[PDB]
Design an enzyme around this catalytic site. Structure first.
Site, PDB file in Angstrom:
ATOM      1  N   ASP D 176      90.767  41.788 110.043  1.00 51.03           N
ATOM      2  CA  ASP D 176      89.516  41.953 109.291  1.00 51.03           C
ATOM      3  C   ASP D 176      89.098  43.406 109.060  1.00 51.03           C
ATOM      4  O   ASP D 176      88.135  43.663 108.342  1.00 51.03           O
ATOM      5  CB  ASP D 176      88.356  41.164 109.919  1.00 51.03           C
ATOM      6  CG  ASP D 176      88.685  39.699 110.122  1.00 51.03           C
ATOM      7  OD1 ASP D 176      89.720  39.241 109.594  1.00 51.03           O
ATOM      8  OD2 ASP D 176      87.903  39.005 110.808  1.00 51.03           O
TER       9      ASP D 176
HETATM   10 MG   LIG Z   1      89.772  37.180 114.974  1.00 53.71          MG
END
Ligand SMILES: [Mg+2]
Ligand SMILES: [Mg+2]
Ligand SMILES: [Zn+2]
Ligand SMILES: [Zn+2]
Ligand SMILES: [Zn+2]
Lengths: 182, 863, 63, 204, 102, 56, 51, 76, 51, 369
Positions: D176
């Site tokens: 992310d």
């Molecule tokens: Mg994760």
């Protein structure tokens, strides 16, 4: 009132309008930054592993829509249910002068040979969240499970070390044959 | 000089009188608003609390001064509320005049011998305790008082009785006095106490009847300034207030009854002092209605944190610490002969620079703050034996933590590598043990001080020492996503890296000089490097291993092994030979967590220094491949031509009419009900299976009309966040939306949404999306998906409650269990819970997937 | 907040082409052609002028 | 199944919804009135008086066969949705093409929009908020919603159009994480100012 | 947009409250304390009180009153109310003969 | 014939602590680090005089 | 009582501080609807998106 | 109609003579009261006829160590 | 609130009982107390009234 | 080929011997001496170095490892995580219990023989062999009726239905329109309460063995397996064909009351494992074995908390901070007799090094010179 200038530094939180939250991992000079034959240089580079797992087509479509919007001049309507069907923005993007696929040819700014693939580049609207690392970091000059972890490893000294030795250690004198504190 | 044991019991009057500093006699507090010092209950050689040091011989100023106990000579004995039921259970189980346990010789002999077989189990000793009680309670002919007929007792809250005899058939109830009871317990010999719940030495029965009341110290009765007096003190004031009246009435005239009234009153007050929340005892409240909280209400009622960022350029055991955090967190280092120069340069650099210091502790113990003054004359003839608090240096032992702390793997020892900016850097393969990602996750940073602690963490909690998870026989720290994709591209059939690529990028790892890089397998097309050979440049020269890769399936299963009972024409069954990668491709099977077949092998056979190396160099290897070649997902990766579209359209129509025929049959009462389930449930169950069948079929159709050799598909089939279950949802259809089991029904009185006809049980009506995320959801479908999407929110977030609680229960049950040196799991009370742990005694973190030494593997190792 | 002086990605002068851009479009002339008549090659630099908001015409009327 | 009853609610707290009444197949009032709406002829109040828009609470909505689009208007549809994109609320309207995403993701982004940085108050330099934020060079989101313009988000945005590239470079965007152009930052992009006002009362 | 108050400087806002419709009968589900129950919130000038008419599993059928819980039979309360004759209570419940037979 | 992890950690810590409070270190001469790493290198040469008495 | 968000009726959280962190935030906060239930016990039937 | 005996989940229960009892309790360096325990009410104990004082030697198949012998005292 | 009003409450209470009998009879169907037909919103106005 | 194994049994644990024998024998490549010696040396090296290190704290690590996957864990009814909770917390009657009844060496290969069992254990009352009920006209009162299908596939017939009159409070007889009629000219039993008659009269039927419900059959590898919707282990054995050497039931206690304690432990382990595996995640069996052993210790299966393991004796301090426990710590401490320790929470509350981990090691060093 006091103001504080805040440049998007390492650790700040960024997120698009698709629940695609992320933290700045590294600030790389534009020079090392790869450029597209058309002259475009990325502002934010997201890992391609955060797309097929999640199912957020709207973000990709938004990238293409932002590309078309940037080229044409139209702001593009993405209102729910009543916005241009993605394939139309894809079919228009080219006649504007760009691969339908949202991807272009990108050159590696480090070595120099262009990558042997196409790179999906778009214009997606990112929002800066109020989660600035400037207000998260702090230092000092640990409950149940946090005890059980040291126990699991077996670090006894480390326990005492953290929970007692660095607080209120009190010394009392016990009688040997009595058992009552002297 | 530390605590071996603690042995509880009951305090004797003698102890309370000897351990007292002074006899408290004046029922008063401080008094008042000026000059708080009296001669009874307050600092009359008893304890210090105000900024005035005077005390009981020990002087000892208010700062640091362990409180001293006092005593109260009770004018009359007083039953202790805590023993009331026990005192009762004792009284009607033993003989008055006698002192015997009303048991025959035989009974005692065999009972004690049944009492030693249970001498550790607190739960199972009470069964026999009460059994004994009832067996004595039924008798009236003890073997040590010519028997004199025992008047059964009565009780409560603190009163006792005895239904004696004097008339004939009468049953008058002689009252019972604390003096009587106590003097009646003093007859019971030390020989009989073990057969009860008492001790001859630790806990005599007579001591259950307080003759002297111990007064808590001044330090335990602090005054809560605005002063809000302490409750204990007040109740004590009342107790002495009655005690003195009683003694004064005993010394003077004795109308008996008066003394009885006062005695019972004193009894009340002490009873309240012991427990204000007692039963049958009016809570002694303060003038406001607010109940006093006494004893029974009294024992009842160097780190840092910041955001994390990735860093596959630091060692797997290293941690990136912002140099500002490094300048706040300090370590105690005693100056010795090897760091004399370093520390002196550190302290001279002051709290500034980068390798500086903030404090200095001389051998006397006085802390010196390096801020003010200057680092000049401070950093002089330090001599050995001092202590510098230097800023964090590259390599210091440090604990990295991310909450919630599920398994132990949540806290690991790292090596500080001081870097600018303002986040913690975590090497990427150490993400699974912490369960961390990036979006916004923050972690904790601990800095231990004592050398013993630092060492212990560095020897036992270091990252490299925990690549394998104790839960299952496999590695936890490994390739995540790109590591998998990079391993695949690097170990592909068509993997030919020009000199420019191999040579320049092997510097992300190491190991060449002579007989490593050699010699360029392919000069056919051009002089080039096969990826298998480049990967081969890492594995040691003796690991021969073979395991099928992920693609060793479907009609592409095949086989064609051949044992040794050399060319190369294989692909699936990954074959590595003495470091040489003969056949196979690297993926989720090859590297990555959870697995259990390669990374596992290099950590059993060569655990610490090698395992970390293979890990560290591989990431940077795999990463540069991915980076230099270009790896992306476009929007066309999920696109199907018109043909697949028409096909799916016809499929969803078929499924629709299948459901309608089911509904039309249900309406006409054409029965056909399922065996177990109710008729209404049969309809629903049949439809759900029918639609689920069609869903998987639609997805099966989708995997054909989509190029299986582009980036996206690689990731699905490779080992970087993949799952055919989601692929069907992205291209084909999401499927039936459910709510806690059943379909979506909760809506209007006659339907779900106001866009359908009342009672419409059609496919679209009860919440079924036909379109996938690509084609786009319709207004209805978008709402249905939201109703079905609320599930993941509620479910995943609710499971935490039961998980955390359940774990907290079993943690608080097994936290005492250890493996003794004789290889045995024993409870802390010496109870062999398990002769040899786990039956075999092999740690699950060190076994080959449950197997006590993988025999088939060890044998093969013959080269 | 008055056109981001220069640009972000393409980091060249662009503020100096604010007024005439706006005013040219404020007659009906499609922006995607107006931009072309001016120094607006790549879209990255074009975006900075396309999606701007000039909030300042609110903020000044204060202090 | 065997009772007929008629309920009338005229209280003080019912949540209704405006709908185009459809008698037979023709929805009440047509282009005749839209033509006048775009003009300063009939306001929306005049509309509700005329009898095109009708407020249905839950109870009254129970007796309604609503048509989604004006294309499927059979002689059974009682009412007609003006715009289904108004199903969601004001923050969920900030998401472009929300019907192309997953419910949880939409939830995240929508709830996350209340965390974006921009100008939410023209009078900020006189405001006394405990802690406020101001994004230097904000931008209108390209490919937005028709709602965003009416809500006034277009007049007071909170974010910028980043030309994003999708690939893992250097392995610093994994899990992310996200990589940022140095130059862009150094030129303004994504810069913002933090605000915090302290107070002091001369207590007597 | 407005809609908030300014108390003591800070901008205070009233968060809209979703309550179960006042002055109304709602039959609860089943077998938590005893079978089926109907529930009635009722409001009169500031104060709000509850009135349940729970039919417990033997047909007693009680009613709850604010002042001291201890439920009383439906017919007790009905007669203390203003209905004397049994025909009154019975027909007031329902005019349906079958239901009247219960 | 060997030590357990816990015993290793324990011994290392002990020796390091001995070195901190003074107590000359066995064969080390050219170094430049903390007492911990001194005990650690000392252990790498198996010259740490600390013995683990096991209850058996 | 308006500044503390605790009404006389024993209810609390009636008034909140107008969330001002950006423009969208305030508008959304003015249009927020809250239920008065238990913050801990699970209301499965009250949380599900009703038709 | 047969019996229980070493069947579905039933291991080889045996009774210890004084010899193996004393020796076993000597090996693990423990007292009589420190063993896991069974009850005289336990079906598997009444079937094998165990008295409150016996130490049943239990032989079970373990899918990890194969064959394992546990020990327990019969009580109530 | 007055004594004349009793005679009315009577009937109301009767209906309440009726509903109960019906649900136990299997001819009512449990009241969906989450359906917005049976849901009323207290806005700023009425809160300020009650205050 | 007859000597190495024997003298290898000393460093080995017998089992590895059987395995090794299997390999070096069954390998058509019979090595020489040196290779065998080397191999045994290696296998033994592995075993000796795979042993658990004394000083570990496997209670805590097994607890953590068994409680960790729970977070990542989101007819037959069956269960999942709440099952783990039910089995770990004893619980007399597990929510929705199931039996996997096997058959001996004859009905295992015959459908007609497995079906007999199925219908014989299913146990069906009257509310299942019916469709509905109605009243009469005037004085007729009432009368039986349908249905008929539950007889034409289970195999019960109207006969033993007539049998029913086994001391019944009433019971009549009249199989007419497929709907068996039942006229009862008596009271002193029922007056008009046709509601409470749900259980008795209609429910107090039994056409079958055990007190259970539905039974679904399923084959699995040339073996017929019978699936029960509940449990009655005691009376499940007294059914023709039921293999007493293989009946499995998730319903604990019953296993402890029928089979014994060891079988209860084995059942605990087996069930935990089966659940975990049927969830996808895997945990090493040794942890589960530890928990199960600790649980079945004391001579009876008891819950893992408060009313069981956490509830029992440790030292007073392990119950002294037992959350404000009036009737406990007040009760436990009010009994002043003895006190031990060498626990875990007692030492950390007191400021002592826990006796786990390193704490169980003692150093020694001669100081010359
Ligand atoms: Mg994760
Ligand atoms: Mg996270
Ligand atoms: Zn003192
Ligand atoms: Zn006697
Ligand atoms: Zn540009």
């Amino acid at each position: 009132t006091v103001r504080d200038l805040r440049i998007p530094e390492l650790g700040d939180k960024f997120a698009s309008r698709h629940g695609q939250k992320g933290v700045i991992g590294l600030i790389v000079p534009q020079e090392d930054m790869p450029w597209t034959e058309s002259g475009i240089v990325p502002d934010l580079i997201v890992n391609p592993h955060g797309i097929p797992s999640r199912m957020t087509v709207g973000q990709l479509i938004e990238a293409i829509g932002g590309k078309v919007a940037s080229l044409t001049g139209r702001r593009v309507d993405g209102t729910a249910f009543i916005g241009e069907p993605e394939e139309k923005l894809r079919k228009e993007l080219e006649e504007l002068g760009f691969k339908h696929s949202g991807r272009e040819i990108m050159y590696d700014g480090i070595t120099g040979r262009r990558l042997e693939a196409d790179i999906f580049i778009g214009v997606i609207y990112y929002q800066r969240l109020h989660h600035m690392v400037a207000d998260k970091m702090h230092a000092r000059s640990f409950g149940e499970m946090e005890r059980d972890v040291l126990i699991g490893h077996g670090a006894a000294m480390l326990l005492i070390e953290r929970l007692l030795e660095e607080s209120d250690k009190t010394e009392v004198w016990v009688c040997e044959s009595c058992g009552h504190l002297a | 000089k530390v605590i071996g044991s603690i042995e509880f019991g009951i305090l004797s009057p003698q102890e309370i009188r000897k351990m007292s500093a002074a006899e408290i006699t004046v029922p008063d507090t401080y008094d008042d608003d000026g000059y708080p010092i009296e001669g009874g209950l307050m600092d009359k050689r008893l304890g210090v609390i105000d900024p005035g040091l005077r005390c009981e011989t020990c002087g000892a100023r208010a700062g640091e001064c362990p409180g001293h106990f006092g005593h109260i000579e009770l004018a009359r004995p007083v039953i202790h509320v805590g023993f009331a039921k026990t005192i009762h259970r004792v009284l009607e189980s033993t003989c008055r005049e006698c002192g015997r346990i009303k048991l025959t010789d035989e009974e005692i002999e065999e009972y004690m011998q049944k009492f030693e077989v249970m001498g550790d189990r607190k739960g199972a000793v009470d069964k026999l305790i009460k059994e004994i009680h009832k067996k004595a309670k039924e008798r009236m002919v003890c073997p040590h008082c010519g028997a004199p007929q025992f008047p059964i007792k009565f009780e409560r809250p603190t009163i006792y009785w005895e239904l004696r005899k004097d008339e004939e058939g009468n049953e008058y109830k002689h009252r019972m006095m604390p003096s009587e009871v106590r003097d009646r317990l003093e007859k019971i010999p030390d020989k009989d106490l073990p057969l009860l719940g008492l001790h001859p030495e630790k806990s005599r029965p007579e001591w259950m009847v307080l003759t002297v009341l111990p007064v808590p110290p001044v330090t335990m009765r602090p005054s809560i300034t605005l002063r809000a007096e302490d409750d204990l003190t007040h109740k004590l004031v009342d107790i002495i207030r009655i005690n003195n009246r009683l003694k004064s009435n005993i010394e003077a005239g004795a109308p008996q009854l008066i003394i009885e009234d006062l005695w019972d009153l004193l009894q009340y007050h002490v009873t309240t002092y012991i427990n204000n929340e007692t039963s049958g005892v009016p809570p002694a409240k303060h003038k406001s209605g607010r109940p006093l909280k006494t004893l029974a209400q009294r024992l009842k009622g160097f780190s840092a944190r910041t955001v994390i960022s990735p860093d596959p350029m630091i060692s797997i055991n290293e941690v990136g610490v912002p140099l500002a955090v490094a300048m706040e967190l300090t370590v105690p280092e005693k100056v010795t002969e090897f760091n004399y120069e370093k520390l002196k340069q550190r302290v001279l650099n002051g709290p500034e620079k980068y390798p500086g210091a903030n404090y200095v502790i001389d051998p006397e113990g006085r802390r010196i703050r390096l801020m003010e003054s200057n680092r000049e004359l401070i950093a002089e003839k330090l001599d050995i034996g001092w202590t510098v608090e230097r800023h964090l240096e590259d390599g210091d032992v440090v604990l990295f933590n991310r909450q919630p702390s599920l398994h132990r793997m949540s806290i690991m020892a790292h090596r500080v590598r001081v870097m600018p900016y303002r986040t913690f850097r975590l090497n990427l393969p150490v993400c699974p043990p912490y369960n961390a990602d990036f979006d916004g996750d923050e972690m904790n940073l601990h800095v231990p001080q004592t050398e013993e602690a630092q060492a212990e963490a560095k020897i036992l909690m270091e990252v490299q020492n925990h690549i394998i998870s104790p839960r299952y026989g496999g590695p936890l720290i490994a390739g995540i996503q790109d590591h998998i994709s990079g391993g695949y591209l690097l170990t592909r059939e068509g993997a030919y890296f020009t000199r420019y690529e191999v040579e320049q990028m092997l510097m992300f790892a190491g190991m060449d000089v002579n007989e490593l890089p050699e010699p360029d397998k392919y000069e056919n097309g051009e002089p080039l490097w096969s990826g298998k050979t480049i990967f081969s440049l890492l594995l040691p020269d003796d690991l021969t291993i073979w395991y099928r890769n992920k693609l060793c399936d479907e009609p592409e299963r095949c086989e064609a092994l051949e044992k040794l009972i050399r060319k190369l024409a294989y692909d699936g069954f990954v074959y590595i030979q003495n470091g040489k990668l003969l056949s196979g491709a690297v993926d989720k099977k090859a590297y990555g967590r959870e697995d259990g077949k390669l990374l596992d092998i290099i950590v059993r056979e060569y655990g610490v220094e090698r395992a970390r190396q293979f890990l560290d160099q591989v990431t940077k290897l795999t990463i540069w491949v991915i980076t230099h070649k270009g790896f992306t997902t476009a929007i066309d990766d999920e696109d199907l031509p018109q043909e697949a579209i028409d096909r799916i359209h016809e499929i969803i129509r078929e499924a629709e009419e299948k459901v309608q025929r089911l509904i039309e049959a249900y309406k006409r009462g054409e029965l056909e009900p399922l065996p177990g389930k109710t008729l209404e449930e049969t309809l629903e169950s049949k439809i759900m299976a029918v639609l689920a069948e069609a869903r998987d079929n639609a997805g099966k159709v989708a995997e054909r009309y989509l190029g299986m050799n582009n980036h996206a598909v690689i990731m699905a089939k490779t080992g970087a966040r993949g799952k055919i279950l989601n692929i069907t949802q992205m291209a084909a259809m999401l499927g039936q939306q459910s709510i806690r089991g059943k379909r979506l029904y909760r809506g209007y009185r006659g339907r779900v949404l106001t866009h359908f006809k009342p009672g419409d049980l059609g496919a679209r009506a009860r919440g079924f999306v036909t379109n996938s995320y690509k084609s786009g959801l319709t207004p209805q479908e978008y709402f249905f998906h939201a109703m079905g999407g609320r599930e993941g929110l509620v479910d995943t977030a609710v499971r935490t409650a039961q998980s955390g609680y359940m774990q907290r229960r079993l943690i608080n049950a097994l936290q005492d269990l250890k493996v003794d040196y004789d290889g045995t799991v024993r409870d802390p009370t010496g109870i062999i819970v398990q002769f040899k742990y786990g039956e075999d005694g092999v740690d699950p973190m060190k076994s080959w997937q449950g197997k006590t030494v993988d025999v088939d593997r060890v044998i093969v190792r013959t080269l | 907040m008055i056109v981001p002086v220069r640009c972000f990605t393409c980091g060249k002068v662009l503020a100096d082409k604010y007024y005439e851009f706006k005013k040219r479009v404020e007659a009906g002339e499609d922006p995607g052609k107006v931009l072309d008549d001016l120094g607006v090659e790549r879209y990255c630099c074009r975006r900075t002028l396309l999606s701007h908001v000039e909030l300042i015409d609110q903020v000044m009327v204060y202090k | 199944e065997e009772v007929k009853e008629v309920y009338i609610n005229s209280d003080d707290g019912r949540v209704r919804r405006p709908l185009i009444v459809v008698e037979n197949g023709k929805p009440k009032l047509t282009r005749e009135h839209v033509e006048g709406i775009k003009n300063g002829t009939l306001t929306w109040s005049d509309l509700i008086r005329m009898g095109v828009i009708e407020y249905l609470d839950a109870e009254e909505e129970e007796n309604a066969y609503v048509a989604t689009w004006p294309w499927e208007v059979t002689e059974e549809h009682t009412h007609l949705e003006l715009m289904p994109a108004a199903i969601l609320g004001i923050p969920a309207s900030l998401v472009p093409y929300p019907e192309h995403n997953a419910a949880p993701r939409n939830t995240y982004g929508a709830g996350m929009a209340k965390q974006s940085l921009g100008l939410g108050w023209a009078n900020f330099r006189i405001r006394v908020d405990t802690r406020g934020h101001l994004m230097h060079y904000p931008q209108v989101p390209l490919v937005n919603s028709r709602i965003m313009k009416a809500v006034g988000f277009e007049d007071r945005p909170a974010g910028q159009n980043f030309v994003v590239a999708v690939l893992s470079y250097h392995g610093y965007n994994m899990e992310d994480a996200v990589i940022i152009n140095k130059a862009s930052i150094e030129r303004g992009l994504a810069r913002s100012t933090f605000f915090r006002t302290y107070e002091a009362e001369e207590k007597r | 947009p407005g809609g908030y108050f300014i108390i003591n400087g800070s901008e205070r806002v009233i968060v809209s409250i979703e309550d179960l419709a006042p002055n109304k009968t709602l039959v609860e589900r089943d077998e938590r304390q005893n079978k089926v129950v109907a529930k009635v919130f009722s409001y009169r000038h500031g104060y709000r009180a509850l009135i349940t008419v729970e039919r417990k599993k033997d047909g007693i059928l009680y009613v709850t009153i604010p002042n001291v819980p201890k439920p009383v039979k439906f017919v007790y309360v009905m007669r203390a109310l203003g209905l004397l004759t049994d025909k009154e209570i019975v027909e007031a419940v329902s005019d349906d003969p079958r239901i009247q037979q219960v | 014939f060997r030590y357990t992890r816990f015993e290793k950690a324990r011994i290392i810590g002990a020796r390091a602590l001995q070195i901190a409070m003074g107590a000359p270190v066995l064969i080390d001469v050219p170094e430049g680090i903390t007492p911990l790493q001194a005990a650690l290198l000392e252990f790498e040469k198996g010259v740490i005089p600390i013995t683990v008495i096991r209850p058996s | 009582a308006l500044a503390t968000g605790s009404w006389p009726g024993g209810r609390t959280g009636v008034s909140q501080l107008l969330d001002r962190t950006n423009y969208m935030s305030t508008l959304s906060h003015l249009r927020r609807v809250t239920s008065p239930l238990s913050r801990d016990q699970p209301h499965f039937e009250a949380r599900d998106l009703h038709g | 109609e047969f019996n229980i005996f070493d069947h579905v989940l039933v291991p080889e229960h045996r009774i210890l003579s004084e010899e193996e009892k004393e020796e076993l309790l000597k090996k693990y360096r423990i007292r009589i009261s420190q063993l896991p325990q069974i009850k005289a009410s336990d079906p598997a104990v009444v079937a094998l006829g165990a008295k409150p004082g016996d130490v049943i030697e239990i032989k079970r198949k373990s899918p990890t160590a194969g064959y394992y012998y546990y020990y327990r005292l019969v009580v109530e | 609130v007055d004594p004349e009003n009793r005679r009315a409450k009577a009937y109301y209470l009767g209906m309440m009982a009726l509903k109960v009998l019906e649900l136990s009879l299997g001819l009512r169907g449990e009241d969906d107390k989450d359906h917005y037909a049976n849901k009323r919103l207290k806005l700023a106005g009425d809160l300020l009234k009650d205050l | 080929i007859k000597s190495m194994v024997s003298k290898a049994e000393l460093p080995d644990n017998i089992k590895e011997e059987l395995y090794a024998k299997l390999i070096e024998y069954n390998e058509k490549y019979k090595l020489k001496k040196d290779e065998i010696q080397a191999i045994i040396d290696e296998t033994v090296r592995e075993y000796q170095k795979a042993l658990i290190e004394p000083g570990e704290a496997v209670g805590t690590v097994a607890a953590q490892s068994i409680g960790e996957p729970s977070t990542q864990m989101t007819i037959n009814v069956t269960l999942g995580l709440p099952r783990i909770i039910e089995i770990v917390d004893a619980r007399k009657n597990p929510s929705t219990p199931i039996m996997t009844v096997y058959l001996d060496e004859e009905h295992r290969y015959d459908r007609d023989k497995a079906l007999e069992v199925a219908r014989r254990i299913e146990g069906t009352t009257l509310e299942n062999l019916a469709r509905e009920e109605t009243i009469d006209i005037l004085n007729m009162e009432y009368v039986v009726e349908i249905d008929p299908e539950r007889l034409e596939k289970a195999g019960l017939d109207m006969e033993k239905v007539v049998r029913k009159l086994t001391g019944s409070f009433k019971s009549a007889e009249f199989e007419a329109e497929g709907y068996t009629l039942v006229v009862r000219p008596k009271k002193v039993t029922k007056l008009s309460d046709l509601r409470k008659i749900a259980e008795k009269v209609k429910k107090h039927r039994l056409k079958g063995l055990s007190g259970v419900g539905k039974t679904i059959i399923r084959k699995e590898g040339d073996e017929y397996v019978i699936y029960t919707e509940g449990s009655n282990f005691k009376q499940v054995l007294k059914v023709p064909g039921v293999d007493p050497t293989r009946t499995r039931t998730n319903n604990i206690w019953e296993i402890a009351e029928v089979l014994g304690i060891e079988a209860a432990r084995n059942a605990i382990i087996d069930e935990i494992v089966s659940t975990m595996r049927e969830q996808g995640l895997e945990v090493d069996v040794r942890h589960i074995m530890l928990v199960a052993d600790m649980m079945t210790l004391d001579g009876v299966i008891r819950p893992i908390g408060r009313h069981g393991i956490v509830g029992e004796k440790a030292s007073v301090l392990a119950r002294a901070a037992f959350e404000i426990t009036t009737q406990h710590l007040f009760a436990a401490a009010e009994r002043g007799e003895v006190d031990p320790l060498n626990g875990v929470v007692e030492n950390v509350l007191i400021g002592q090094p826990v006796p786990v981990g390193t704490g169980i090691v003692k150093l020694a060093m001669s100081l010359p010179l």
